Design a protein around this ligand. Structure first.
Ligand code: PLM
Ligand code: PLM
Ligand code: PLM
Ligand code: PLM
Ligand code: PLM
Ligand code: PLM
Length: 581
């Protein structure tokens, strides 16, 4: 263990080191040009090979934290470009690394990355493959300076995979665009989850996080003993607190540790793990954390012995409340992978709340014998909406369904921005497609999964530009109560309808040109605007107007002189709708 650079270069491989060095630098120095970092990276790599050859050589003894610092502080235009940051360089180390972390900018002012024409990509990718990929790695890096670097590195390679396949396929855009849309979407998702998880830790504190993890880890490793789960939860909770804080190496090394541990103690934890524990350093902890729920033990009791019918319960509770409730959750979670992490927390919070009454009451055993009764309705609420709504998505496909929701929520929260209403109805809709194709024993996690990100995205927009007290309530409640609070929203019976607008219901023959996506967005803005103009309108009345609009369109887009039909027939539609409503 002579040299941390040498170890990390041996550990990683040149090609990975190089990628990670690049992502590291790109995250701290977001206003420098790609070609500058190639210079850095290669300067570091060239250096890193010295030490691999002879860990005694100049500076090899130095700390990665110290060599990264020294590198940063030899950028000349550093005060010019960044200003405050430069002042960090005047600190001797331990603080200096902190000072660079402090003065990172999350969310700079940078132009949106344009996706080129398919053919430009494939061509460039052929012409010069590495410079193509790293360039774009450099661009996502600077735009997400707090994203775990090897996770990012993992996407680059799924990216490389998608070029390698489709730029040798006759119909390039037919292949590539969905693959890339998948990845766009799967990275915004990921890059939100991290922001949520960290924000959850600061606001709600370390306790609740452990609660969450226990439920989770127990769902995943049901054969493990509660102490093992506790060992895991604990270290895992360290890991999130350190990775949030933004130190790459602390986050990395901590994670590495945990992967060693899990694979060394493999038999104690999960059968479904051999696979992952084969994969090399970088992929290990990624893989572990993605992995399937292990199959549950056949020989499995009711909980009721240890948590209802035993005496010694109030003693066992009071002896250590958080550990006893831990045990409750461990036992309840591993019996139910088909529950949402959050569902299981509603059980524990409800349980908790009874013992607070019943251990302090005259007859404890009798104050609480009817408590798993209290769970019955808590488990059915999420189960029912799933059945109800996945039934409804079965009737009307993804699209007709999106419009069902678009009506639903526009009624509930009419004050929302119309685009905002369209995007979430659209996004929700998609969840329906994804999660409803699973069986019932597998739906409720999937949906928690998705809803949680949508529901957050929702609440960030709202944080920035507030529009509704009732929304604010949900976004400023526990991540446990979040989804129900939304489900609890009712039709806004206060709402004053919006002044009719001629232009809003005028359409032109340009929509017949537009892609089915493009069209649908046009149609769907209308439907909202319609809902916001005549909210007191019935589904029947609405399916009426919607069907007319639909015929109208397909009349003027199967007609000579399209433009003048849209002005004339549209004149009718509006008057005849204005009427019916
Ligand atoms: C001059 C030195 C600059 C810093 C070097 C770049 C940092 C790369 C090291 C990250 C190692 C990641 C370890 C994998 C842990 C995991 O499984 O996620
Ligand atoms: C990581 C390397 C990314 C390679 C893909 C380049 C295309 C980026 C366009 C962004 C998008 O998908 O919306
Ligand atoms: C290894 C011990 C883990 C500690 C387990 C904590 C048990 C608490 C379970 C109830 C859910 C807590 C959610 C936070 C919000 C609240 O209820 O106040
Ligand atoms: C799945 C269908 C997705 C369509 C969006 C609207 C349905 C939302 C109901 C799902 C309930 C989420 C369960 C997670 C929980 O709170 O425990
Ligand atoms: C920026 C703020 C936008 C807010 C959009 C308000 C619309 C509410 C959407 C909540 C969807 C959650 C799914 C709940 C399922 C249910 O209806 O029971
Ligand atoms: C005041 C009334 C104004 C009436 C204007 C009619 C607006 C209709 C927009 C509905 C879009 C329905 C699309 C359904 C489909 O794809 O078939």
């Amino acid at each position: 263990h002579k040299s941390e650079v040498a170890h990390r270069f041996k550990d990683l491989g040149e090609e990975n080191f190089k990628a990670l060095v690049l992502i590291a630098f790109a995250q701290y120095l977001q206003q420098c040009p790609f070609e500058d970092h190639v210079k850095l990276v290669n300067e570091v790599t060239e250096f890193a090979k010295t030490c691999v050859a002879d860990e005694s050589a100049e500076n090899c003894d130095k700390s990665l934290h110290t060599l990264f610092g020294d590198k940063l502080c030899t950028v000349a235009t550093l005060r010019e470009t960044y200003g405050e940051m430069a002042d960090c360089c005047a600190k001797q180390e331990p603080e200096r690394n902190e000072c660079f972390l402090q003065h990172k900018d999350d969310n700079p002012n940078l132009p949106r990355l344009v996706r080129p024409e398919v053919d430009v990509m494939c061509t460039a990718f052929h012409d010069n493959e590495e410079t193509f990929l790293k360039k774009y790695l450099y661009e996502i890096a600077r735009r997400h300076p707090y994203f775990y670097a090897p996770e990012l590195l993992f996407f680059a390679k799924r990216y490389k995979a998608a070029f390698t396949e489709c730029c040798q396929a006759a119909d390039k855009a037919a292949c590539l665009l969905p693959k890339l849309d998948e990845l766009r979407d799967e990275g915004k998702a990921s890059s939100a989850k991290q922001r949520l998880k960290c924000a959850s830790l600061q606001k709600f504190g370390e306790r609740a996080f452990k609660a969450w993890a226990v439920a989770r880890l127990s769902q995943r490793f049901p054969k493990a003993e509660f102490a093992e789960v506790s060992k895991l939860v604990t270290d895992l909770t360290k890991v999130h607190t350190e990775c949030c804080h933004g130190d790459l190496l602390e986050c990395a090394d901590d994670r590495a540790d945990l992967a060693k541990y899990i694979c060394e103690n493999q038999d104690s934890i999960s059968s479904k793990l051999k696979e992952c524990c084969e994969k090399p350093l970088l992929e290990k902890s990624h893989c572990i954390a993605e992995v399937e729920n292990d199959e549950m033990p056949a020989d499995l009791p009711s909980l009721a012995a240890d948590f209802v019918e035993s005496k010694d319960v109030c003693k066992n509770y009071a002896e250590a409340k958080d550990v006893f409730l831990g045990m409750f959750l461990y036992e309840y979670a591993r019996r139910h992978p088909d529950y949402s992490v959050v569902l299981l927390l509603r059980l524990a919070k409800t349980y908790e709340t009874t013992l607070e009454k019943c251990c302090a009451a005259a007859d404890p055993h009798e104050c609480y014998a009817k408590v798993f009764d209290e769970f019955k309705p808590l488990v059915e609420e999420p189960q029912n909406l799933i059945k109800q709504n996945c039934e409804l998505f079965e009737q009307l496909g993804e699209y007709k369904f999106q419009n069902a929701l678009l009506v639903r929520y526009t009624k509930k929260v009419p004050q929302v921005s119309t685009p905002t209403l369209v995007e979430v109805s659209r996004n929700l809709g998609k969840v329906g497609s994804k999660c409803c194709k699973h069986p019932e024993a597998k739906r409720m996690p999937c949906a928690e999964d998705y809803l949680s990100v949508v529901l957050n995205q929702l609440c960030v927009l709202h944080e920035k530009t507030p529009v509704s007290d009732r929304v604010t309530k949900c976004c400023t409640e526990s991540l446990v109560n979040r989804r129900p609070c939304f489900s609890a929203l009712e039709v806004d019976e206060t709402y004053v309808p919006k002044e009719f607008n001629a232009e809003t219901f005028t359409f032109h023959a340009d929509i017949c040109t537009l892609s089915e996506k493009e069209r649908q967005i046009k149609k769907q803005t209308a439907l909202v605007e319609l809902v916001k103009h005549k909210p007191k309108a019935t589904k029947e009345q609405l399916k009426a107007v919607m069907d007319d609009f639909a015929a109208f369109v397909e009349k003027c887009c199967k007609a000579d002189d399209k433009e003048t039909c849209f002005a004339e027939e549209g004149k009718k539609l509006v008057a005849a709708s204005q009427a019916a409503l």
